[PDB]
Structure formats: structure tokens, C-alpha cells
């Protein structure tokens, strides 16, 4: 349900079991790794109220790599708290939420940044080419 700086991650919500697959995989993998956490850290981040739950998982895809990674990010907890009451918490879903966003920036809504704009100049944007007429 959440897109990230030219990327976009979709949310799956309806109670089930373990193995929450991202794309069509398993937030065990998610191999653009290094910072492979911050993904498993939404679920881990559940460290504030829940321990893992027993629910669902969906696929992302847009822009490029770390973009996507950051997208699947919100994607998750931006879908634990899912309305609710069949998804979030049948009452006071600020349970997670305010907790899963008292140290967040992914589920903590998205960033007002997004690529565009250049210039009749050099590279463009602001970096206008280097000229030194004599």
C-alpha cells in the first residue's frame, strides 16, 4: 500500500500463519541485503507490542533497489495497522502504530521527495555546466 521515492510496495492483509513472503519470497531472504534488516525490522520492530502476529504478506515493485527495499518497509507495518478490525487490531490499533512509529519513518508515512526537474544548463537540476569564457 506504500510507495517510496519513485518505488511502490503493495499490502496483503487477512489473518493466517507464518512465512510472510515479499514479492514472492520470504523476509528471511530479501537479498539486496546488507541492510537487509529495516525490512525484517518492521516485523522485528513489532518489538513494542506484538511478537509477529499470525497474518499476511504482499509483493512490491517499482523504481530500483534500495528504493524498493525502503518501500516493502512501510508496506508491512503500513498494513499491520490495516483499518482494522480484521487487520490492525479490532480495537485501539494505536497499539502498534504510535509505537511502530515512535521510532519510524517507513510506516511513519512517506517522504515528500521525488525525482524530476533539470535545467537549460549543464547536467541540469542545479549543477549548471562549467564554463569560463575569457
Amino acid at each position: 500500500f506504500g510507495k517510496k521515492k519513485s518505488a511502490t510496495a503493495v499490502a496483503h492483509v487477512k489473518a493466517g500463519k507464518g512465512l510472510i513472503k515479499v514479492n514472492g519470497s520470504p523476509i528471511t531472504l530479501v537479498e539486496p541485503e546488507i541492510l537487509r534488516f529495516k525490512v525484517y525490522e518492521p516485523l522485528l520492530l513489532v518489538g513494542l507490542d506484538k511478537f509477529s502476529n499470525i497474518d499476511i504478506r504482499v509483493r512490491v515493485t517499482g523504481g530500483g533497489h534500495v528504493s524498493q527495499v525502503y518501500a516493502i518497509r512501510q508496506a508491512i507495518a503500513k498494513g499491520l495497522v490495516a483499518y482494522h478490525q480484521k487487520y490492525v487490531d479490532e480495537q485501539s490499533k494505536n497499539e502498534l502504530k504510535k509505537a511502530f512509529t515512535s521510532y519510524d519513518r517507513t510506516l511513519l508515512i512517506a517522504d515528500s521527495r521525488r525525482p524530476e526537474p533539470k535545467k537549460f544548463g549543464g547536467k541540469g537540476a542545479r549543477s549548471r555546466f562549467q564554463k569560463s569564457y575569457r
Binding site: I34, L35, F37, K38, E41, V66, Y70
Partner: protein
């Protein structure tokens, strides 16, 4: 954006002489708390032009820079940029010609910064040990800035900047 954790997670909540701590994990006066320094150590590392691997860099530099005589790693990193900042250098004069340069603070965030990209630099400039461990130079040099926090041994200009802004004052 966009690092990690664990790997030791030795969070020394003390070690912070002078001011500092009132900005040991900050930026503001101009960020906020750009993750407890080690988000800038890892960042001041992007001197080719792109983070990640930079991220690795940091991490490796860490496990390494603590494995080797552990001081809680993070507190070596704090205690790195800790006893390793400038402290009232000079800055031009204008009162002459043909200036002279007088000295003083050192706006904290300075002291942290001006030593951050600095220790960063001394690292970058391998050439000793011109090995292949970027994170080593990055560590040792930062380690020679923890153990080096016992003179000299990598910073140096650390002093210079200060051990100079005394005479021409």
C-alpha cells in the same frame, strides 16, 4: 536512511567530555540526531560518491575495530570522535593587509564534524597501511585513534590545529 544495528550493540551512554553529548548523537544548531554519529562515520565514508558498501565498510570497520582489543566498538567510535576534535583554531584576520588569524571555538557540532570527516580523511588517505582493508585504515587510525587515543597516532593534525592556535593568537 539507512544502516543497521546489533553486531555488538555496545551502547556506552557515558563517555562524552566537554559539551558533545548534548550533541553526541545529534546535528541541529543543523540536523537532529543523524543516527548516533555512526550514521555519519558510515556516511563521511561516501568519498567516491555513493553509500552502501560504504555501509559494509562501516560494519566491517566495526567488527574489526573492536574484535581488535574491544572497547565496545561503538564507544571506540564515540571515544574515537571523542578525544579527537579540534578546539579553537584560528580563522583569518583582515586586520592588517595581509592578515594574521586569531582563534576560538569550535561550535561543538564543529568539534564533532571537523574531526569526523577528518578521521574519515586520514583513513581514506591509506598510503599507510596501504593494505587492502579500507575499513582497516578506517578502523586502525580510528583504532589508532582509540589506542591512538593514547598518542598519537593517526589524527595528529588534531593537535596541530590547536597546538598552533596558541602562538599566532
Amino acid at each position: 536512511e539507512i544502516k543497521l544495528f546489533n553486531k555488538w550493540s555496545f551502547e556506552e551512554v557515558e563517555v562524552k567530555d566537554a559539551s558533545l553529548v548534548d550533541y553526541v548523537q545529534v546535528r541541529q544548531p543543523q540536523c537532529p540526531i543523524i543516527e548516533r554519529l555512526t550514521n555519519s562515520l558510515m556516511m563521511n565514508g561516501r568519498n567516491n560518491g555513493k553509500k552502501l558498501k560504504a555501509v559494509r565498510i562501516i560494519k566491517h570497520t566495526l567488527d574489526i575495530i573492536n574484535v581488535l582489543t574491544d572497547q565496545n566498538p561503538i564507544q571506540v567510535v564515540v571515544d574515537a570522535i571523542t578525544n579527537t576534535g579540534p578546539r579553537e583554531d584560528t580563522t583569518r584576520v583582515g586586520g592588517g593587509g595581509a592578515a594574521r588569524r586569531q582563534a576560538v571555538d569550535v561550535s561543538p557540532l564543529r568539534r564533532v564534524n571537523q574531526a569526523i570527516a577528518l578521521l574519515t580523511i586520514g583513513a581514506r588517505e591509506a598510503a599507510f597501511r596501504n593494505i587492502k582493508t579500507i575499513a582497516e585504515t578506517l578502523a586502525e587510525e580510528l583504532i589508532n585513534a582509540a589506542k591512538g587515543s593514547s598518542t598519537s597516532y593517526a589524527i595528529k593534525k588534531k593537535d596541530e590545529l590547536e597546538r598552533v592556535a596558541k602562538s599566532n593568537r
